[PDB]
Write a protein that binds this ligand. Structure first.
Ligand code: HEM
Ligand code: HEM
Ligand SMILES: [Zn+2]
Ligand SMILES: [Zn+2]
Ligand SMILES: [Zn+2]
Length: 172
């Protein structure tokens, strides 16, 4: 019953309910799967996750998690820019692809791929919602969304740069 999801995550013709609800279309299976399991075992405990995903995840078994992961991964069209213009695309592009050395900000593409397509456990960011990206970078920077990799990666990202990388990524 994907309509246990689509109310919020939207549907082929409707975006997600709010900027903080990430698009799922085309997200990699292993990633989707990891998140759903994290929500289920509460390992991903950032605020929005606790509030809007622990509940629904609690009613998911290994089989459904995988079924769902598969479903959204195949969804078409994969998560795309809504068309809403976000300032900083250029800035964010340089950050995503080149990172910022003196600020010790890693080049995002090394893990998220040449253009935010991601791969397996490394999530696609291309086409993700602007607010959602900023929100997750905030959670990673905050430490409220626990992930050794991203907690370390987000350590030096400022709110301003989060917006740039978000603008860029959500425009893809
Ligand atoms: C069983 C159906 C659902 C599935 C499979 C599902 C799956 C997911 C996945 C895999 C993510 C993480 C995406 C990412 O990291 O990019 C996510 C995030 C989210 N979902 Fe769902 N979801 C479902 C239903 C819902 C519903 C019904 C709501 C609203 C009550 C909801 C609200 C959210 C929100 C707000 C987030 C982002 C939370 C956060 O920042 O941690 N989801 N969902
Ligand atoms: C400043 C560059 C980077 C930015 C802006 C960035 C941004 C993000 C965002 C917004 C997410 C959340 C995706 C979602 O919820 O759908 C994410 C997840 C992730 N990123 Fe990055 N990232 C960057 C660099 C990296 C690097 C260099 C690595 C590998 C060392 C990495 C590994 C990951 C992994 C593994 C996840 C998924 C975490 C999980 O399993 O829950 N990221 N990243
Ligand atoms: Zn895949
Ligand atoms: Zn957007
Ligand atoms: Zn700080």
């Amino acid at each position: 019953v994907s309509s246990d999801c689509m109310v919020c995550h939207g549907m082929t013709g409707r975006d997600t309910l709010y900027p903080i609800v990430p698009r799922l279309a085309g997200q990699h299976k292993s990633y989707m799967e990891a998140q759903l399991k994290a929500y289920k075992d509460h390992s991903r405990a950032d605020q929005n996750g606790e509030i809007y995903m622990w509940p629904v995840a609690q009613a998911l078994d290994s089989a459904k998690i995988t079924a769902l992961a598969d479903y959204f991964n195949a969804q078409k069209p994969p998560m795309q820019s809504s068309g809403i213009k976000h300032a900083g695309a250029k800035e964010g592009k340089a950050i995503f692809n080149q990172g910022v050395t003196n600020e010790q900000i890693p080049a995002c593409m090394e893990c998220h791929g040449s253009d935010g397509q991601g791969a397996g456990p490394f999530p696609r960011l291309a086409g993700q919602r602007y607010g959602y990206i900023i929100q997750q970078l905030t959670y990673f920077h905050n430490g409220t969304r626990v992930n050794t990799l991203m907690n370390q990666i987000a350590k030096n990202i400022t709110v301003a740069q989060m917006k740039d990388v978000a603008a860029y990524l959500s425009s893809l």
